[PDB]
Amino acid sequence: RFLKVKNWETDVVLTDTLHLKSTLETGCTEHICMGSIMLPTKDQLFPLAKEFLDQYYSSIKRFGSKAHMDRLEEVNKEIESTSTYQLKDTELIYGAKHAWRNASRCVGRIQWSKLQVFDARDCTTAHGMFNYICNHVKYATNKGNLRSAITIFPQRTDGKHDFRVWNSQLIRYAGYKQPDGSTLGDPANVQFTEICIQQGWKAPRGRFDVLPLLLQANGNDPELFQIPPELVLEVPIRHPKFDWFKDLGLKWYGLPAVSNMLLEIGGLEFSACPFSGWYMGTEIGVRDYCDNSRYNILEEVAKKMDLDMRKTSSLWKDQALVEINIAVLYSFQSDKVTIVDHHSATESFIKHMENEYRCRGGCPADWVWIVPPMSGSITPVFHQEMLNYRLTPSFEYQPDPWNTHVW
Amino acid sequence: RFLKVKNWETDVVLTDTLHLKSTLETGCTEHICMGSIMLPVRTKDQLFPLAKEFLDQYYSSIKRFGSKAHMDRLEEVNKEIESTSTYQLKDTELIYGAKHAWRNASRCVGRIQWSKLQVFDARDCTTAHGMFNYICNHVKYATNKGNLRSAITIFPQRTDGKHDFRVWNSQLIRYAGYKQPDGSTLGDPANVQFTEICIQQGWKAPRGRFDVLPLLLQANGNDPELFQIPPELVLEVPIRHPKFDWFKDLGLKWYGLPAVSNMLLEIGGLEFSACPFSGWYMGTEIGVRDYCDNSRYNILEEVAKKMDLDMRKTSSLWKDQALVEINIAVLYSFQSDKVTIVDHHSATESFIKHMENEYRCRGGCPADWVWIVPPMSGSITPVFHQEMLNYRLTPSFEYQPDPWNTHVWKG
Ligand code: HEM
Ligand code: HEM
Ligand SMILES: Cc1cc(N)nc(CCc2cc(N)cc(CCc3cc(C)cc(N)n3)c2)c1
Ligand SMILES: Cc1cc(N)nc(CCc2cc(N)cc(CCc3cc(C)cc(N)n3)c2)c1
Ligand SMILES: [Cl-]
Ligand SMILES: [Cl-]
Ligand SMILES: [Cl-]
Ligand SMILES: [Cl-]
Ligand SMILES: [Zn+2]
Ligand SMILES: [Zn+2]
Ligand SMILES: [Zn+2]
């Protein structure tokens, strides 16, 4: 009921009391831990509404006030009548900021209160969606000086009028299977690229083709739109000491913008809610460049470095991995595009977590994701025990729309 | 029930049925996952089912389930429990149990080797002097002049909890740590408390950076006694780097035999509180944890200085660069001196092959991702993208409290 977490580097011990407000399931049981599994009605809605409105009213120091009670009744009334309800703007901004606050897999949550929420609940068409998105992209990008944002489209109704961004991120590179058997571009986006072509996109068939947006308004069939190239800030990748690095032909985009998740606030479901921040360097240099199912360039970089690749024990993979990550950071910094390295991001997070422990009573965190995908042990999060539990408002996974949408 | 795990690199999906045999708890609930928490006398009543469980597994493994030998063994154990409150394992059962506790060790990446464990039965041991002899023998055998062999030594089981055998050392071989008055630490900061006990017990500390600790050994619940391991039995490797000639002048060395001696072995409900076991090192345990943890030798700054990296900002990745160089050094030194060691790529690759084979033949392989993923370069190893299920099978190794915390002193 009071839970202790220890830091094995500093001996510091912290007490979590926030977990007693956990609600959704973890996937784990007393018999089996699923901590490393990536995906482990009117009657239903009012409790969720109440739970949310109670936390909102508590947060502005107005708990049990007539204004609190009157909103509970109003929402109760509207649920009884319409089977759903509408959030006040203040509630929407609170709910969104808190869904980020509660994202146990996010190392960047120190920034959670500074989120810019764009309310797009008046949107009715895919063209309208496209406009809201370009606006979000321009605002978030800010000529390289990135600002966090989320844009919130209309909430689910019957579940057959869903708004969805079919892209998994607003900005991402196409993937194509070649007669050769190999893959050109990003292998992660092969499927989504084919649907784009099936829908009518003229693919440039290159290595770094920014995908078009495929947008679904009001449950209608989704539509293609090209983001104005001038709004997609990209960074060519060079290394501060290896001149040959640039020749590998590498570049990436400055804006990480997740667009396939669902935002849940007070039982209400926001199926299109793209949100963006800025990159931690390892996301591009370790995952995007170096996963075997991604650009997979470790081999080619190690070769240009003339490392000995005869035996794994030379740590050639590791040497190359560092230099690739050095080059990413260097390139973003030289072009004045916001980026954070994993030492700085995790130090910031440990500061955030201690802040949350004193002020909120805990900070749900998923160690498997919070510890960076390289040099884990030499970052201050490795030795930090974490408790992982689900608080609402939250971001949730949802299935890809092509598996569900009826044409 | 069937449980699926996926590999996000290869899309290979595996099905777990072995979790149905799980017992003890994880610490987790449907409301809270404690997957990253490091640590979240038995009655006749609880003992016979534990024994039966174990002997059913044992007789299955040998294709003799339900046999006359099986049933006679259940009955023989049952009555021994009735009349003595405990029972004795056959040697065959002990070997099987120990091998399985390793096979079931969800935090161990080295499990491909589980079936080749040399088991030394020390249940006839009665004194600390006897323990010391058993341990020197274990060390000499396991070390094998640098061609390392896995081994475990098993001392008598717990009886009433007042007569425990305990190795007070957390590992058989480890370096002393000394807190200086100015607040610095000489040698290994992990062993300061234990070093202090040793000294209090009469150990004459050399007070150097790499002093091999004496063994502190408790037999039959008696006060523990000090013994120095013969230096000729302690294999050590001077650490140097294949390209950087100044690396040797850091004065680093490490011991070749990792030998955990503070855990408890549970088999068939019996508790073996002194069961030191050893294998060989994965390079990162020395180069990442032992050398570069801030609470350990903490040499990252010194190495980076000598390399003349840009240390003005974390974003040059100077710490990562030095980390890789130190780990390169450790593996190069070990290989050159022909002392068994495994790099993290080869170890995790072997583990994945082990794990898949365990799914085919056993219906699962419980694994703790937090420990299985190496402490550097996680994502470029094949375990990072591997979903794992963590649950507890017996026989097992368990944590137990440090003995200076519970021991009743006799004087
Ligand atoms: C401001 C800069 C931000 C940074 C540096 C950052 C960092 C990260 C990282 C590194 C991960 C996954 C671990 C990895 O990729 O290695 C992640 C996950 C996540 N973040 Fe952030 N984040 C930022 C902003 C945001 C914002 C603005 C939101 C929402 C408003 C958000 C919500 C999430 C969620 C829901 C996940 C989990 C995604 C999933 O389960 O797939 N983050 N974050
Ligand atoms: C043969 C070579 C072996 C290798 C390379 C190896 C490797 C490792 C590593 C790397 C870890 C923890 C992860 C880390 O420290 O970064 C570990 C943990 C562990 N291994 Fe092994 N292992 C070996 C042999 C053994 C043997 C012989 C046993 C027992 C019979 C054993 C049982 C365990 C246990 C119980 C843990 C968890 C320790 C704890 O919770 O503190 N391993 N192993
Ligand atoms: C808003 C925001 C900003 C920012 N800078 N970064 C993000 C996360 C984006 C992200 C995108 C993808 N495709 C995969 C992962 C990790 C996928 C993963 C992680 C682990 C630990 C294991 C595994 N199998 N997969 C993270 C969001
Ligand atoms: C028999 C054997 C052979 C072999 N090569 N290695 C071992 C494991 C030895 C070991 C010893 C210590 N002191 C700490 C750890 C990990 C400590 C740790 C890991 C993680 C993931 C987090 C954390 N806080 N602490 C492991 C046993
Ligand atoms: Cl990405
Ligand atoms: Cl990934
Ligand atoms: Cl160690
Ligand atoms: Cl550690
Ligand atoms: Zn769990
Ligand atoms: Zn990856
Ligand atoms: Zn450590």
Swiss-Prot record, chain B:
What the entry says about post-translational processing? Answer: Ubiquitinated; mediated by STUB1/CHIP in the presence of Hsp70 and Hsp40 (in vitro).
Q: What is the effect of changing Y281H?
A: 50% decrease of nitric-oxide synthase activity
| Tissues expressed in | Isoform N-NOS-1 is expressed in brain and colorectum. Found in the Auerbach's plexus of the enteric nervous system. Isoform PNNOS is expressed in the penis, urethra, prostate, and skeletal muscle, and coexists with the cerebellar nnos in the pelvic plexus, bladder and liver, and is detectable in the cerebellum.
Q: Where in the cell is it found?
A: Cell membrane, Sarcolemma; Cell projection, Dendritic spine
- Residues bound to (6R)-L-erythro-5,6,7,8-tetrahydrobiopterin: S36, V370, W371, F384
Kindly list the positions annotated as binding heme b. Answer: C108, Y399
- Protein role: Produces nitric oxide (NO) which is a messenger molecule with diverse functions throughout the body. In the brain and peripheral nervous system, NO displays many properties of a neurotransmitter. Inhibitory transmitter for non-adrenergic and non-cholinergic nerves in the colorectum. Probably has nitrosylase activity and mediates cysteine S-nitrosylation of cytoplasmic target proteins such SRR. Inhibitory transmitter for non-adrenergic and non-cholinergic nerves in the colorectum.
Instruction: Tell me which family the UniProt entry assigns to this protein.
Output: Belongs to the NOS family.
Domain free text? The PDZ domain participates in protein-protein interaction, and is responsible for targeting nNos to synaptic membranes. Mediates interaction with VAC14.
Q: How does it assemble?
A: Homodimer. Interacts with DLG4 (via N-terminal tandem pair of PDZ domains); the interaction possibly being prevented by the association between NOS1 and CAPON. Forms a ternary complex with CAPON and RASD1. Forms a ternary complex with CAPON and SYN1. Interacts with ZDHHC23. Interacts with NOSIP; which may impair its synaptic location. Interacts with HTR4. Interacts with SLC6A4. Interacts with VAC14.
Q: What is this protein called?
A: Nitric oxide synthase 1
What is the protein's species of origin?
Rattus norvegicus
